[PDB]
Paper text:
The ABC-type transporter (NikABCDE) imports the metal from the extracellular environment through a multi-step process in many bacteria, including Enterobacteriaceae and S. aureus. While a bacterial nickelophore dedicated to the NikABCDE system is currently unknown, exogenous environmental l-histidine is believed to be a widespread ligand. l-Histidine forms Ni-(l-His)2 complexes, which exhibit a strong affinity for [name] for efficient transport into the cell through the NikBCDE ABC-type transporter. [name]-metal complexes target the periplasmic Ni2+ uptake protein [name] through high-affinity interactions and compete with Ni-(l-His)2 for uptake.
[name] [name] (22-524), which shares 75% identity and 90.5% similarity with the K. pneumoniae ortholog, was purified for crystallization studies. Ni-[name] adopted different coordination geometry when bound to [name] compared to the stand-alone structure determined in our previous work, indicating that two configurations of the Ni-[name] complex are possible. Superposition of the Ni-[name] structures showed that relative to [name]’s l-Asp unit (l-AspAMA), the penultimate APA2 and N-terminal APA1 are rotated by 93.3°. The interaction network between [name] and Ni-[name] revealed that the conserved His416 residue occupies the axial position within the Ni-[name] complex. The remainder of the ligand binding pocket of [name] around the Ni-[name] is composed of Tyr22, Met27, Trp100, Tyr382, Trp398, and Tyr402. Notable CH-π stacking interactions occur between Trp100 and APA2, and APA1 and Tyr382. Extensive electrostatic interactions also occur with the carboxyl groups of Ni-[name], including hydrogen bonds with the side chain of Arg137 to the α-carboxyl of the l-AspAMA residue. Ni-[name] induced the closed conformation of [name].
Author numbering: 2 to 500
Write the structure that this text describes.
Amino acid sequence: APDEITTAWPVNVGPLNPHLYTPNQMFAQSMVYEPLVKYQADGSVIPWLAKSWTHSEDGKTWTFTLRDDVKFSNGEPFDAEAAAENFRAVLDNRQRHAWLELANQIVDVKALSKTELQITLKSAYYPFLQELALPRPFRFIAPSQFKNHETMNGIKAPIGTGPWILQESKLNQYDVFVRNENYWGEKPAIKKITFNVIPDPTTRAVAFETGDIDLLYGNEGLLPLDTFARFSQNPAYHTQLSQPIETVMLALNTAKAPTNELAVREALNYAVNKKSLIDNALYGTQQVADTLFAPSVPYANLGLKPSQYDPQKAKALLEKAGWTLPAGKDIREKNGQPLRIELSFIGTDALSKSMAEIIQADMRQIGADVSLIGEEESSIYARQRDGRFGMIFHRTWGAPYDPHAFLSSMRVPSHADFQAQQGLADKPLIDKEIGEVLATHDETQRQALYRDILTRLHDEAVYLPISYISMMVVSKPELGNIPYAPIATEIPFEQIKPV
Ligand SMILES: N[C@@H](CN[C@@H](CN[C@@H](CC(=O)O)C(=O)O)C(=O)O)C(=O)O
Ligand code: NI
C-alpha cells in the first residue's frame, strides 16, 4: 500500500500529553499538536496558528490574531479561548517548566475575542517567539480533553490540530497514526504511519533489511553505525546524513568523587582518543568535538582551547593529584581507594553503548577503572535530574535551543547539567550570568556573557565533548530524498511522498 509507511522506534509514543515530558516522545507530540508560530531553518518563525501579531512599545504585551479556520481533529474549534485554556493548564504546572525561561516570563494569557489572544510577559523577553515554537510545552490540545480542567494530571484523548491523529497504541508493540483529513493546511501525501516498538538496535536494522519497515529517521544511534555504513554502500537502500546538529558529550559530576577533582576531569578529557573513536567505531560519520557547543552554534565561536589526546599528560595530572599506581597494579589508588567511576547511558542507543566501550578502554590506559551502566531512558533521565551519576552520557538540543535554552535549563534540575555543576565554586555566578544573557538587549554584552559562561564551563572541564552528531535517515529508494525538519527532534512526515 503505497501511501502508507511503516517505521520503528525504541519505545512507545507515550500518552501524548502536550504539556508533559518523557514518556511522551517529542516527534509524536509534534505530529499531533501545533504552535502559534513555526520555527524555520534560517532562525526565524512564521505565522502558524497565529496569522499575525502586534506588541506594545515596551515589548511586554503581545496580541496574537489567530486563524478562524482551524479545527481540532475531533471537529471542535481552535480559538482564543481554547489557546488561553491551554496556556492556563501549562502554567498551573509552572514549576515543571522552569527550565524554559518563557515559562517564567508569562504573567497573563487573555482571550479578547474568538480570534484575539493576548499574552503578557514580565519583561521584553526576546526569545519569546522561538520558545513558543518548540515541540512542548506551548502547543494545544482541545480543552474538552482536559481532566478536571487541567492537563498536568493527564488527558482524555490526544486531540490536537495537527496533520496526524493517534489512532492506536499497543504497549511495547506499536503505535499507529492516520492522516487528519480535516487539517487546515496541506493534506500530507502519506495516509497512515505505523511505528513498531523495537528497542534493540540490531533488531531495528534487521527489520529494515527484511523489508519489514520502510524508513528510519533519527539520531545517529538509531542504527548500529557499522550497519548504517554498509546500508550506504547498498544500491538497494537509500541513506542520508544531515550536517551536524548536536553535541554528544559526557556530563562529569563535579559533585561526586572522584570526578569532583579538576585534575581528574582534565585527565579524563586528555584520556579519550576521540579521532580513533570517530574514525573506527563510528565510521567517519561525525566530527571531533572539543567544546560543549560547536563553533557553528550562535555566540559559541570563542576559540576555546581543545584538550587533545594525551595519555602521558593525563597520567601526570593524576599522579600530582595523589592518584598513584600500586606495585604491579593498573588501577590508581588514593589513600587506599582505587580510581573507580561509573558511566551511565541509555541502553537502547547504539552510539552510546559503542562509545562507552571505547571510552572505558581508553580510561583504563591511564589507571581509571570505569564501570558501564546501561538503563532505560526513564531511569537515565531521573539520574540526570537528581545527581546519581559519575559520568553520564548527554547531548545538546539543536536549533533553536542551542545555546540559550540549553543554558537556561542549567539553572534547575533538567537534564544532567545543574547537578553536574553543583561542585563548581562559581556555579551561582554562572547561573546569575545565564539569567543576564537571557535578559540583555545589548549585543556586545550578550556576547561577553556567552563567552564568560562557556569559557568557565570549558576551563573547569565540566564536560567531555565527544563528537558533533547528525541526523541519520534510511529509506526505500521509492520515498526519494527525505527532508530534515529545522527542529532536531521533529520528523517531517508530512513532506514525504510515495511513488
Ligand atoms: N527530556 C527529559 C528532561 N527534559 C527537560 C527539558 N528538555 C527539553 C529538551 C530535550 O529534552 O530535547 C525537553 O525534554 O522538551 C526538563 O524536563 O527539564 C524529560 O523528558 O524529562
Ligand atoms: Ni528534555
